[PDB]
Amino acid sequence: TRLRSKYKIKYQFYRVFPSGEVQYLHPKDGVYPEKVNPGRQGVGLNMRSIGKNVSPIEVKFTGKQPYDL
Amino acid sequence: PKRGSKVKILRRESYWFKNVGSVVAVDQDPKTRYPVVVRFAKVNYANISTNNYALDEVEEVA
Amino acid sequence: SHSVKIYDTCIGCTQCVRACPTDVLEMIPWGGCKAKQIASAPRTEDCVGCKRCESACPTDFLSVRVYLWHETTRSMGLAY
Amino acid sequence: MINLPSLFVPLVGLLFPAVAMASLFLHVEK
Amino acid sequence: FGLYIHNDTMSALGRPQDMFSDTAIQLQPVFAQWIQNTHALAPGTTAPGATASTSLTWGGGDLVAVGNKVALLPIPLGTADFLVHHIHAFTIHVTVLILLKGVLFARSSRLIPDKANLGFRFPCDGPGRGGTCQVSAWDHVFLGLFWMYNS
Amino acid sequence: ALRIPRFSQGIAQDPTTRRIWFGIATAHDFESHDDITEGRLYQNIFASHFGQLAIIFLWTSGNLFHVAWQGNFEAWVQDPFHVRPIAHAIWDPHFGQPAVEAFTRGGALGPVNNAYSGVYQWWYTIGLRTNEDLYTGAIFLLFLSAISLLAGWLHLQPKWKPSVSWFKNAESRLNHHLSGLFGVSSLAWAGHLVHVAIPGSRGEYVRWNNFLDVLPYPQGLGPLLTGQWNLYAQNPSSSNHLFGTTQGAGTAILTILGGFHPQTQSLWLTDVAHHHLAIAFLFLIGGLMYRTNFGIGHSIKYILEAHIPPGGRLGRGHKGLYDTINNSIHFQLGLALASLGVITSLVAQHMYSLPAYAFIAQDFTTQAALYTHHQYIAGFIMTGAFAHGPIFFIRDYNPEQNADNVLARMLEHKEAIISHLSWASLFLGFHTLGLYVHNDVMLAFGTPEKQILIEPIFAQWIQSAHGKTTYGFDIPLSSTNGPALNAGRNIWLPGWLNAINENSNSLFLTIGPGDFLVHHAIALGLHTTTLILVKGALDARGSKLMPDKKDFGYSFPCDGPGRGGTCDISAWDDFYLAVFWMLNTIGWVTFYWHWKHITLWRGNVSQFNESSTYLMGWLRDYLWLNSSQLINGITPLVCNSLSVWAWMFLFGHLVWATGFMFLISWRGYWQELIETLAWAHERTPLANLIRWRDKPVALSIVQARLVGLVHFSVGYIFTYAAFLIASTSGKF
Amino acid sequence: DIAGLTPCKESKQFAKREKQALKKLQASLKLYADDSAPALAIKATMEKTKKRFDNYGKYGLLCGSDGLPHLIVSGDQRHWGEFITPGILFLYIAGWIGWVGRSYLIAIRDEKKPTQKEIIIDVPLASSLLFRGFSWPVAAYRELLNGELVDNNF
Amino acid sequence: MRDFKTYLSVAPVLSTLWFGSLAGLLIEINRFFPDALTFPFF
Numbered sequence A: 001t002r003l004r005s006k007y008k009i010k011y012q013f014y015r016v017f018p019s020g021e022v023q024y025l026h027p028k029d030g031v032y033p034e035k036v037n038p039g040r041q042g043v044g045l046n047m048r049s050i051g052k053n054v055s056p057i058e059v060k061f062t063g064k065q066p067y068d069l
Numbered sequence B: 001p002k003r004g005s006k007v008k009i010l011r012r013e014s015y016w017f018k019n020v021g022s023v024v025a026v027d028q029d030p031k032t033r034y035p036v037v038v039r040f041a042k043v044n045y046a047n048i049s050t051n052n053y054a055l056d057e058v059e060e061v062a
Numbered sequence C: 001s002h003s004v005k006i007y008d009t010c011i012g013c014t015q016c017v018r019a020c021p022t023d024v025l026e027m028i029p030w031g032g033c034k035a036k037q038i039a040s041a042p043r044t045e046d047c048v049g050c051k052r053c054e055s056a057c058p059t060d061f062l063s064v065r066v067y068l069w070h071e072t073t074r075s076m077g078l079a080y
Numbered sequence D: 001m002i003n004l005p006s007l008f009v010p011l012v013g014l015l016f017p018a019v020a021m022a023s024l025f026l027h028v029e030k
Numbered sequence E: 001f002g003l004y005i006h007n008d009t010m011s012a013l014g015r016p017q018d019m020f021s022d023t024a025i026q027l028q029p030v031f032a033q034w035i036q037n038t039h040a041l042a043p044g045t046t047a048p049g050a051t052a053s054t055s056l057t058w059g060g061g062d063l064v065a066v067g068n069k070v071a072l073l074p075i076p077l078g079t080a081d082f083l084v085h086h087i088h089a090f091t092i093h094v095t096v097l098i099l100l101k102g103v104l105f106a107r108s109s110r111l112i113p114d115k116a117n118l119g120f121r122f123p124c125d126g127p128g129r130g131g132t133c134q135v136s137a138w139d140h141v142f143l144g145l146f147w148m149y150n151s
Numbered sequence F: 001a002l003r004i005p006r007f008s009q010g011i012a013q014d015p016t017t018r019r020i021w022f023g024i025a026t027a028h029d030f031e032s033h034d035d036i037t038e039g040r041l042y043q044n045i046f047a048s049h050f051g052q053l054a055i056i057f058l059w060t061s062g063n064l065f066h067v068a069w070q071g072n073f074e075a076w077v078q079d080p081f082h083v084r085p086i087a088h089a090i091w092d093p094h095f096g097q098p099a100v101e102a103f104t105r106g107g108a109l110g111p112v113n114n115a116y117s118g119v120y121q122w123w124y125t126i127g128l129r130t131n132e133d134l135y136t137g138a139i140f141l142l143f144l145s146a147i148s149l150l151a152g153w154l155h156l157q158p159k160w161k162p163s164v165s166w167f168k169n170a171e172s173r174l175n176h177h178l179s180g181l182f183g184v185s186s187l188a189w190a191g192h193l194v195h196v197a198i199p200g201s202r203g204e205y206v207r208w209n210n211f212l213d214v215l216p217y218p219q220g221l222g223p224l225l226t227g228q229w230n231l232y233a234q235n236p237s238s239s240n241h242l243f244g245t246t247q248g249a250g251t252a253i254l255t256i257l258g259g260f261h262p263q264t265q266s267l268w269l270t271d272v273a274h275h276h277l278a279i280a281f282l283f284l285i286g287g288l289m290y291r292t293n294f295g296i297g298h299s300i301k302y303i304l305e306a307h308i309p310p311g312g313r314l315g316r317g318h319k320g321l322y323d324t325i326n327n328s329i330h331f332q333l334g335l336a337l338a339s340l341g342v343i344t345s346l347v348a349q350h351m352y353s354l355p356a357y358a359f360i361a362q363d364f365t366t367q368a369a370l371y372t373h374h375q376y377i378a379g380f381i382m383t384g385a386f387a388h389g390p391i392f393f394i395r396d397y398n399p400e401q402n403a404d405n406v407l408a409r410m411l412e413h414k415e416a417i418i419s420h421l422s423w424a425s426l427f428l429g430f431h432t433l434g435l436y437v438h439n440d441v442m443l444a445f446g447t448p449e450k451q452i453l454i455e456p457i458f459a460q461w462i463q464s465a466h467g468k469t470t471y472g473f474d475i476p477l478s479s480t481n482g483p484a485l486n487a488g489r490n491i492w493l494p495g496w497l498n499a500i501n502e503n504s505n506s507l508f509l510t511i512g513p514g515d516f517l518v519h520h521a522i523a524l525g526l527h528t529t530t531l532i533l534v535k536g537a538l539d540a541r542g543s544k545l546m547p548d549k550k551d552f553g554y555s556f557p558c559d560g561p562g563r564g565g566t567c568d569i570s571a572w573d574d575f576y577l578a579v580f581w582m583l584n585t586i587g588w589v590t591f592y593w594h595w596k597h598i599t600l601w602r603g604n605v606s607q608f609n610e611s612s613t614y615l616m617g618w619l620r621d622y623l624w625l626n627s628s629q630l631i632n633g634i635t636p637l638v639c640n641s642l643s644v645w646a647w648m649f650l651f652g653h654l655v656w657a658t659g660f661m662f663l664i665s666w667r668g669y670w671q672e673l674i675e676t677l678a679w680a681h682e683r684t685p686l687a688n689l690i691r692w693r694d695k696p697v698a699l700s701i702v703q704a705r706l707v708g709l710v711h712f713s714v715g716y717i718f719t720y721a722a723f724l725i726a727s728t729s730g731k732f
Numbered sequence G: 001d002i003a004g005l006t007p008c009k010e011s012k013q014f015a016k017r018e019k020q021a022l023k024k025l026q027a028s029l030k031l032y033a034d035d036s037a038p039a040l041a042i043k044a045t046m047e048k049t050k051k052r053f054d055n056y057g058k059y060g061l062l063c064g065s066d067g068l069p070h071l072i073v074s075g076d077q078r079h080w081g082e083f084i085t086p087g088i089l090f091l092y093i094a095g096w097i098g099w100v101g102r103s104y105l106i107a108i109r110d111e112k113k114p115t116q117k118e119i120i121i122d123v124p125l126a127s128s129l130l131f132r133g134f135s136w137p138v139a140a141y142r143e144l145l146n147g148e149l150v151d152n153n154f
Numbered sequence H: 001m002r003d004f005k006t007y008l009s010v011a012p013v014l015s016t017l018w019f020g021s022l023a024g025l026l027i028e029i030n031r032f033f034p035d036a037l038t039f040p041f042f
């Protein structure tokens, strides 16, 4: 985006390490964080649509039981 | 019937809230949880304000 | 290792969450709001309590914070 | 025979913690 | 500075016996003079004239005043003098670089690298990167001062 | 990537200096530590909270053992009053030959410390002056040290295991557990303060050994039984009787009317031997109140769900709190500092107001020493006592196991306690402090004539009825013939009058004007070292800023720029702020006292009275004067015997101070910098082959407020600390 | 006469430490006393003071040891007023500012749209908005305890 | 002029201005009855 104040465009990065590999969002597919398109996964949010927030004592030594969510 | 009246806010979510009147607009588009479009003249830590709402709430008088 | 929990509604942007530093941002398509959009993190492993993620991100009650406990050379930031 | 108990103080200050900052040097590499 | 401290630990604990003061970590003649002094052969030759020793404060013992009470005289230095000083001598080090640290990184800081994205003041930023605050020079200045006051 | 240390992956895999902070710091945090079943911590504390019982016991088996070596009691027996009460023996290989000119003090022969722990009387009282009959309390608080770490070793073994139930049981751990805990404890005590102390106060090598062939009371053990006693109160030890001696030694035992006799200057022996032998029954009823098995005695329960009165033909309806105070430990560290809160402060004068031994009321060095101390925990227990008072909220409380009953209600109507504890102060804000300032204007502008010093009219009533007959005001009782002081005109009420007012009595002190100018000020402090608390606690349940710190917890380090409208936000970092204003509120009520008290011990009691009602008075000649003995036992000649705080003090006066950088100097200025050279020493050869085991970072913002607090306070516990002592060994 | 604290008239201290305190400003002979400013450190002032000496007197305050006013009302003898006879007014002098304070505000939703409608004060005050301040309580202070509170308003 | 009214305000120095040109009076009164010390009723 530094490349946003002279006009310029299409940044790409990568990884790269011992021994090379990942580690990158542009392009792995350049999904522009913005957009939205294909199949992008779950991991989207508490059964608490927040408001319901309080003392959260569903815990006393959870095991298996939550670690987490 | 009550389109944007002096109607309340009532859920363990909000900022302002009890603070009364105003449902301004209401949609007809079902999915979500956010049908109830509110705008008053009093504000949270934004400035534009107005954020949206609905469901386990309007527990109010006239 | 990013925390704690953070919550629904916004997106699109054009006036909200458009600015995490360390990525941590997809946008699924999903059905509810006024066209389709639900989000926190297609990730959270690059971030970093870059907590500028609600400053750009309204929607009501706590909305972004940190809790790193482990707190990681990935996002405790200290490279060298 | 006799004169002391200094025996203790060059410990409690001098070697003892010399051994605290020694063996839990650590806690890490305990 | 870690040096008055000693001579406290060496006056309380530290028995004049041996420590950092004048008849002490002395430093006999001394400290000179320096120069100044020369500032007092300076007018009798060497810059031919002018009159009387360029400022009585420096020089030898060529000494005046007036009005009963004193005026200026040979204000002689020594220990108590290459002490203290090295504090203004210090301070105006770690009072700059605060300053320079925060004057150089300020816009590009090697650890939020992109600043011109918050303004001049701009509070801190991340509770992330595990504790980013007081980054701004505006706030590099917010303590830029305190010390001055201390200095 | 880094496996060690332990308790959790989280921070133990983590790769910066943190670990070591965030090991050591959060190291008794186990009650949210991924490694703990419903026992594990309940299991834990046990051994744990023996454990120290160990050292408390090796706290003293020593320092007992310590003395008789060191100091000079077996000596000091010959004559009992100067003095330079004698602490330890100081092997400090830095001290300049003037170790003579140093601390060749009291009985010394070595630069010994000037003991102020009081105790040296608390031991003189119980019994002994023979240190060959010490050597033993040592060996005893060892007879308890090893012994009880089997309560360690052992009852930390599944076998002779604990349970959890056993722990939640209420009516046993309590009911039964007053009866033992205190109760019996006294008796023998209550009796030792009876049958081994008397016979030296009579004067007699009673020892243990000769342990029946005494019989210090002539009529055996009869009338105790029977129903007749007053052949006991019979002839109190009497009037002059040089204390613990010959003449006037009026045998008796269990007394309870006389009190002091100038000489001891201190509550006379075995007339609190009836005291400890009464309290008892006042739990040994309310002490077999409940249970063990047996089907008789108390439940609690409808104690509530019926007994929610006082309350209810409306109101609050308790339907049980309980499964909260018994489920929620905190409460057991909600109210066991909470109420061993108070005690600390109601020991902070009882203990002085009338002493208890071998002369202290006229030592003016315990008072000094053994007071403030016993006060600073009425701080450091009284405070951080509501902390485990948010907790249960965001970390025990369920709004639904409870939302019938007071608490949740307390809550529902909470943003109120907050804002009347507040108006409780902005006011105790301007006043007690507005007035207070021409009491500092005038007094400056030649005008003391005119002045706003409004003299307390109220406390005033007390302290007379409770005896005190000192000038004016023709009312009843203390009339020195009055009808509250009658019907009872002999019981309890000649003696506690016989000493009531001339000050080497200090009893109910001499009330001056502006006496409330601090007194008020001290009913400012509090009301404003709560609210902190009762937010940092109360609404710190959630708030509405971030209506979910409920999740978040108690100890989250600040927030970041989050919609410019957030920061330092731990309910913890409200305890932080809370521990500021409280040390402020101690800040004060230790000036008073020193001013006051000090006054007396050199006659001059215009050291107040004249002054304080305009604060340079405080500054000038509470603060400015008296000193530079201390801060002139350093003074470009030598050191003499007040040398230390002349160091310690400037210590407190450093070690304070730099609890400042951490404090004013926040967080992301340290990393950034500590990079720009964490780096420099990564380049520079010769000291290149040195890559360091983990990787230097700056400090969690919490910390960077904590060690602001334990350099501070440590500094601040220091000085006044050394001053209050320094001071007095010059002037008294 | 109560608790101490004597009414001043036995003079012992106060009256004297007074005719001492003020009266070495008076030894200001140390200048030249005729007409001045530049000086009058001597002659006058004491008029407010010494020519108010035995004047101040005069109602006692039972000024006390030190010899100075230990100023007390608590509701005994004449005093029930050394701060209460001038003790009520303050109550009075304040919270009818509250009326202006209220009705100023309780206007700042009337004529409609508000706030800085708080900064531009609409010179809010001079009469009934204040000049009711005069007459609030026990005739109408229970402007409180009916239709205005509750609260009951909209 | 009016009418209560309202009437017209002005900007930032009104709560302030109140301190000076009127509030002073105080010091006149406090002069007028030199000091106060306590209650003078009439």
Ligand code: CLA
Pocket (backbone or CB within 6 Å): F342, F344, F345, F346, F348, F349, F378, F382, F383, F525, F526, F529, F530, F533, F581, F582, F585
């Ligand atoms: C919210 C409150 C909570 C409560 C209930 C208390 C209560 C108390 N604190 Mg305390 N404290 C608190 C929070 C609290 N504290 C906190 C957060 C701190 C940290 C700063 C402290 C630090 C602190 C210190 C340092 C001390 C106390 C002390 C005290 C006790 C002083 C006695 C007194 O009240 O004199 C006056 C009380 C009266 C009731 C007399 C006035 C009567 C008025 C109210 C008349 C109107 C009502 C009616 C006619 C009277 C009935 C009441 C009756 C008891 C007379 C008192 C038990 C002192 C102490 O422990 O004792 C030595 C003192 O040491 N506190």
Ligand SMILES: CC1=C(/C=C/C(C)=C/C=C\C(C)=C/C=C/C=C(C)/C=C/C=C(C)/C=C/C2=C(C)CCCC2(C)C)C(C)(C)CCC1
Pocket (backbone or CB within 6 Å): G095, G096, G098, G141, G144
């Ligand atoms: C009778 C009595 C009394 C009293 C006591 C007490 C202390 C009680 C409690 C009571 C109660 C039950 C109370 C309550 C109260 C309430 C209130 C409430 C107060 C007040 C107030 C206010 C806060 C106000 C406000 C206002 C008004 C109203 C007017 C002016 C303006 C304003 C609006 C601001 C006495 C002393 C004589 C003693 C005996 C008996």
Ligand SMILES: CC1=C(C/C=C(\C)CCC[C@H](C)CCC[C@@H](C)CCCC(C)C)C(=O)c2ccccc2C1=O
Pocket (backbone or CB within 6 Å): F024, F661, F662, F663, F665, F666, F667, F668, F670, F671, F697, F698, F699, F700, F701, F704, F705
């Ligand atoms: C100085 C300073 C640092 C830097 C901290 C540093 C450089 C610490 C370096 C360690 C010092 C050198 C250790 C000296 C004392 C410790 C060894 C004491 C603890 C030892 C026992 C627990 C074993 C911060 O990171 C910081 C963060 C937020 C607010 C304020 C500050 C702050 O003031």
Ligand code: SF4
Pocket (backbone or CB within 6 Å): C007, C008, C009, C010, C011, C012, C013, C016, C017, C018, C038, C039, C040, C053, C054, C056, C057, C058, C059
């Ligand atoms: S975080 Fe931002 S982009 Fe995501 S839903 Fe909320 S407001 Fe929209």
Ligand code: SF4
Pocket (backbone or CB within 6 Å): C002, C019, C020, C021, C022, C023, C024, C044, C046, C047, C048, C049, C050, C051, C052, C053, C064, E128
């Ligand atoms: S912590 Fe905030 S700014 Fe950082 S990546 Fe995550 S959502 Fe974005």
Ligand code: SF4
Pocket (backbone or CB within 6 Å): E123, E124, E125, E126, E127, E131, E132, E133, E134, F557, F558, F559, F560, F561, F562, F566, F567, F568, F666, F667, F701
């Ligand atoms: S402590 Fe630091 S991270 Fe938190 S809001 Fe303040 S400046 Fe930002």
